[PDB]
Design an enzyme around this catalytic site. Structure first.
Site, PDB file in Angstrom:
ATOM      1  CG  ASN A 171      -3.274  11.097   5.100  1.00 26.40           C
ATOM      2  OD1 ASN A 171      -4.354  10.809   5.443  1.00 26.40           O
ATOM      3  ND2 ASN A 171      -2.176  10.338   5.378  1.00 26.40           N
ATOM      4  CG  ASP A 208       0.350 -10.329   7.640  1.00 31.59           C
ATOM      5  OD1 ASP A 208       0.585 -10.223   6.341  1.00 31.59           O
ATOM      6  OD2 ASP A 208       1.445 -11.077   8.383  1.00 31.59           O
ATOM      7  NE  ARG A 249      -3.980  -0.382   1.643  1.00 30.32           N
ATOM      8  CZ  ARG A 249      -4.180  -1.417   2.395  1.00 30.32           C
ATOM      9  NH1 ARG A 249      -3.347  -1.703   3.383  1.00 30.32           N
ATOM     10  NH2 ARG A 249      -4.775  -2.410   1.634  1.00 30.32           N
ATOM     11  CG  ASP A 262      -4.571  -5.075  10.398  1.00 28.89           C
ATOM     12  OD1 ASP A 262      -5.669  -6.095  10.265  1.00 28.89           O
ATOM     13  OD2 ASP A 262      -3.714  -5.164   9.686  1.00 28.89           O
ATOM     14  CG  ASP A 272       0.781  -4.651   6.834  1.00 24.56           C
ATOM     15  OD1 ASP A 272       0.420  -5.668   6.480  1.00 24.56           O
ATOM     16  OD2 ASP A 272       0.042  -3.487   7.217  1.00 24.56           O
ATOM     17  CE1 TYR A 299      -7.489  -1.679   9.388  1.00 22.19           C
ATOM     18  CE2 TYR A 299      -5.217  -1.146   9.361  1.00 22.19           C
ATOM     19  CZ  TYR A 299      -5.945  -1.990   9.212  1.00 22.19           C
ATOM     20  OH  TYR A 299      -5.959  -2.890   8.260  1.00 22.19           O
TER      21      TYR A 299
HETATM   22  N1  GSP Z   1      -5.077   8.040   5.581  1.00 18.41           N
HETATM   23  C1  GSP Z   1      -6.220   7.165   5.325  1.00 18.41           C
HETATM   24  N2  GSP Z   1      -6.204   6.091   5.616  1.00 18.41           N
HETATM   25  C2  GSP Z   1      -7.507   5.475   5.304  1.00 18.41           C
HETATM   26  C3  GSP Z   1      -8.488   6.115   5.011  1.00 18.41           C
HETATM   27  N3  GSP Z   1      -9.643   4.957   5.155  1.00 18.41           N
HETATM   28  C4  GSP Z   1      -8.954   4.034   5.226  1.00 18.41           C
HETATM   29  N4  GSP Z   1      -7.756   4.038   5.367  1.00 18.41           N
HETATM   30  C5  GSP Z   1      -6.718   3.040   5.602  1.00 18.41           C
HETATM   31  O1  GSP Z   1      -6.150   2.641   4.428  1.00 18.41           O
HETATM   32  C6  GSP Z   1      -5.616   1.065   4.569  1.00 18.41           C
HETATM   33  C7  GSP Z   1      -6.837   0.260   3.574  1.00 18.41           C
HETATM   34  O2  GSP Z   1      -7.960   0.217   3.936  1.00 18.41           O
HETATM   35  P1  GSP Z   1      -8.700  -1.085   3.910  1.00 18.41           P
HETATM   36  O3  GSP Z   1      -8.682  -1.536   2.273  1.00 18.41           O
HETATM   37  O4  GSP Z   1      -9.962  -0.995   4.470  1.00 18.41           O
HETATM   38  O5  GSP Z   1      -7.843  -1.951   4.710  1.00 18.41           O
HETATM   39  P2  GSP Z   1      -7.604  -3.822   5.127  1.00 18.41           P
HETATM   40  O6  GSP Z   1      -8.519  -4.488   4.271  1.00 18.41           O
HETATM   41  O7  GSP Z   1      -7.755  -3.816   6.649  1.00 18.41           O
HETATM   42  O8  GSP Z   1      -6.025  -3.717   4.885  1.00 18.41           O
HETATM   43  P3  GSP Z   1      -5.160  -5.005   4.536  1.00 18.41           P
HETATM   44  O9  GSP Z   1      -3.697  -4.282   4.856  1.00 18.41           O
HETATM   45  O10 GSP Z   1      -5.402  -5.883   5.735  1.00 18.41           O
HETATM   46  S1  GSP Z   1      -5.492  -5.745   2.896  1.00 18.41           S
HETATM   47  C8  GSP Z   1      -5.952   0.828   6.045  1.00 18.41           C
HETATM   48  O11 GSP Z   1      -5.003   1.088   6.615  1.00 18.41           O
HETATM   49  C9  GSP Z   1      -7.138   1.846   6.397  1.00 18.41           C
HETATM   50  O12 GSP Z   1      -7.348   1.958   7.641  1.00 18.41           O
HETATM   51  C10 GSP Z   1      -8.633   7.407   5.109  1.00 18.41           C
HETATM   52  O13 GSP Z   1      -9.628   8.120   4.843  1.00 18.41           O
HETATM   53  N5  GSP Z   1      -7.380   7.970   5.141  1.00 18.41           N
HETATM   54 MG    MG Z   2      -3.957  -7.261   7.581  1.00 15.51          MG
HETATM   55 MG    MG Z   3      -1.999  -3.843   8.262  1.00 18.89          MG
END
Ligand code: GSP
Ligand code: MG
Ligand code: MG
Length: 174
Positions: free
Chosen positions: A41, A104, A22, A106, A102, A84
């Site tokens: 951001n 895994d 990411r 969280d 990363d 998060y």
């Molecule tokens: N800066 C920022 N990060 C965001 C925002 N919305 C979501 N994220 C972050 O972007 C990342 C990707 O979101 P998401 O696809 O929901 O995560 P995930 O499915 O838990 O991620 P994975 O690494 O296990 S595949 C996460 O770290 C999430 O918290 C936002 O508005 N701003």
């Molecule tokens: Mg994860």
């Molecule tokens: Mg993660």
């Protein structure tokens, strides 16, 4: 390579095998020390491991530590502050980006402070696929406990005074 207040930086998340997971294109630095980076951001591009791009819709504060194996995203949503938390290597910054591995696992924190531990199953599969060393598994399990203790203490980015100071600082510079 301590990023400077007002500098815009990229944030790059890798897996343990060196592949990008990411990338967040634009974060404005609010604080930069040898141990801690704080950034804001809003409407940043975000790129996934397949190249797909999405745009963040709401502001967030990000918190990075050089001595803890986690980092934290504080998201300002309508009903309040969600966190998060990534279990991760500590960060390193260079002219290209702030970079971390990363790992895994969280932790989601809801606005009332309750936390959920996520991706224990994804962690066990990735640990076997990418052969994480025993010491990494010990460090990551310990840092899950530390991160939970920080949430329960409202320490570091989980402090309401931390959100009040850095939310305002970010609104002003943006
Ligand atoms: N800066 C920022 N990060 C965001 C925002 N919305 C979501 N994220 C972050 O972007 C990342 C990707 O979101 P998401 O696809 O929901 O995560 P995930 O499915 O838990 O991620 P994975 O690494 O296990 S595949 C996460 O770290 C999430 O918290 C936002 O508005 N701003
Ligand atoms: Mg994860
Ligand atoms: Mg993660």
């Amino acid at each position: 390579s301590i990023p400077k207040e007002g500098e815009n930086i990229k944030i790059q998340s890798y897996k343990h095998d060196g592949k990008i997971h990411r990338v967040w294109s634009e974060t404005t630095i609010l604080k930069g020390t040898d141990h801690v980076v704080i950034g804001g951001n809003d409407h940043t591009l975000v790129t996934e491991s397949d190249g797909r791009t999405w745009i963040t819709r709401e502001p967030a504060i990000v918190y990075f530590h050089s001595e803890y194996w986690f980092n934290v995203i504080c998201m300002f949503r309508e009903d309040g502050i969600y966190y998060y938390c990534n279990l991760s290597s500590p960060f390193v910054c260079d002219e290209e980006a702030l970079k971390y591995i990363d790992y895994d696992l969280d932790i989601k924190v809801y606005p009332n402070g309750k936390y959920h531990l996520l991706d224990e199953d994804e962690y066990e599969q990735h640990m076997n696929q990418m052969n994480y060393p025993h010491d990494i598994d010990i460090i990551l399990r310990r840092n899950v406990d530390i991160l939970q203790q920080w949430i329960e203490q409202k320490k570091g980015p989980f402090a309401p005074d931390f959100i009040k100071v850095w939310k305002e600082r970010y609104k002003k510079i943006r």
